[PDB]
Paper text:
The histone H3/H4 chaperone Asf1 (anti-silencing function 1) is required for the establishment and maintenance of proper chromatin structure, as well as for genome stability in eukaryotes. Asf1 is the common entity shared by the RC and RI pathways, because it binds to and stimulates histone deposition by both the CAF-1 and HIR complexes. Asf1 proteins from all eukaryotes share a very conserved 155 residue N-terminal immunoglobulin-like fold domain. Asf1 alone adopts a switched-type immunoglobulin-like (Ig-like) fold containing two extra, short β-strands (termed h and h').
We determined the structure of the conserved N-terminus of budding yeast Asf1 bound to the C-terminal α3 helix of yeast histone H3 to 2.2 Å resolution. Because the interaction between the C-terminal histone H3 α3 helix (H3α3) and Asf1 is of modest affinity (micromolar Kd), we stabilized the association by fusing Asf1N to H3α3 with a flexible linker peptide. The global fold of Asf1N in the current structure is nearly identical to that solved previously without the histone helix. The only significant changes in the structure are a forward rotation of the loop connecting β-strands c and c', as well as a small rotation of the loop and α-helix connecting β-strands e and f. The structure solved here shows that the histone helix binds to Asf1 in this predicted region, but in an unanticipated orientation. The H3 α-helix lies in a pocket defined by hydrophobic residues on one side and an intricate hydrogen-bonding network on the other. Notably, to properly form the pocket, the β-c/β-c' connecting loop folds downward (as compared to the structure of unbound yeast Asf1N), bringing residues Ser48 and Ser50 in proximity to contribute to the hydrogen-bonding network ("loop 1" in Figure 1B). Leu130 makes van der Waals contacts to Asf1 amino acids Val94, Tyr112, Arg145, and Leu96. A lone salt bridge is formed between the invariant residues Asp54 on Asf1 and Arg129 on H3. By binding to and occluding proper formation of the four-helix bundle, Asf1 is positioned to directly disrupt histone tetramerization.
Residue numbers in the entry: 1 to 157, 165 to 174
Write the structure that this text describes.
C-alpha cells in the first residue's frame, strides 16, 4: 500500500571474517497498525549457478509493528562453507536481505560479497583444500540493489546471473 517502507540500511562490522555474523542496522517506516509481524531474512547465495546452493542464514520476526520510524539491528549466522562448492567459496557472490509480511515479500536488498584470502601468498596461489579461517569477506555496501514488491497488507481492498539474483 505500502504500509512498511525501508528507509535505510547500514552494514555493520564490514569487512569481516567469513565465519563472523552479519550485522545490519535497518531503518523502516510503518504507517498503520498491522495484525502481523515483519519477517526479515538473509539468504547467502552458495553458487551463481542454481538456487540449489542457497543457505537461509537466519530470519527474525519483528513485531508488533509500531507506527512511526523504527530502527533495529538484524544479525545472522554465517553460511556453512561445507555446503558451498569448494571452487566457488573464495569468490564474489551475493546476499539477499528481504522482509515479508504474512508470507508476502515486499522488499529485497541485494549486496555483492567479495571473498578473498587475507595473505598475499594465498591470493595468487590458493590451495586445493580451502582455508576458511583465512577468508576475509567484504560486502559491497556502497552498492545496494533494492527491489520493492507491491503486496496486500491487512486489507484486501557469473556476473550475468549474480546480477539476476540481485534484481
Amino acid at each position: 500500500a505500502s504500509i512498511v517502507s525501508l528507509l535505510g540500511i547500514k552494514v555493520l562490522n564490514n569487512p569481516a571474517k567469513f565465519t563472523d555474523p552479519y550485522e545490519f542496522e535497518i531503518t523502516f517506516e510503518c504507517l498503520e497498525s498491522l495484525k502481523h509481524d515483519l519477517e526479515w531474512k538473509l539468504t547467502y547465495v552458495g553458487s551463481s549457478r542454481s538456487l540449489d546452493h542457497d543457505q537461509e542464514l537466519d530470519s527474525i520476526l519483528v513485531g508488533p509493528v509500531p507506527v512511526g520510524v523504527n530502527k533495529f539491528v538484524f544479525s545472522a549466522d554465517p553460511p556453512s562453507a561445507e555446503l558451498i562448492p569448494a571452487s566457488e567459496l573464495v569468490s564474489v557472490t551475493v546476499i539477499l536481505l528481504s522482509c515479508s509480511y504474512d508470507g508476502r515479500e515486499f522488499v529485497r536488498v541485494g549486496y555483492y560479497v567479495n571473498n578473498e584470502y587475507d595473505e598475499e601468498e594465498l591470493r595468487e596461489n590458493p590451495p586445493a583444500k580451502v582455508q576458511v579461517d583465512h577468508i576475509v569477506r567484504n560486502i559491497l555496501a556502497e552498492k545496494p540493489r533494492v527491489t520493492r514488491f507491491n503486496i496486500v497488507w491487512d486489507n484486501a481492498a557469473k556476473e550475468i546471473k549474480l546480477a539476476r539474483r540481485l534484481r
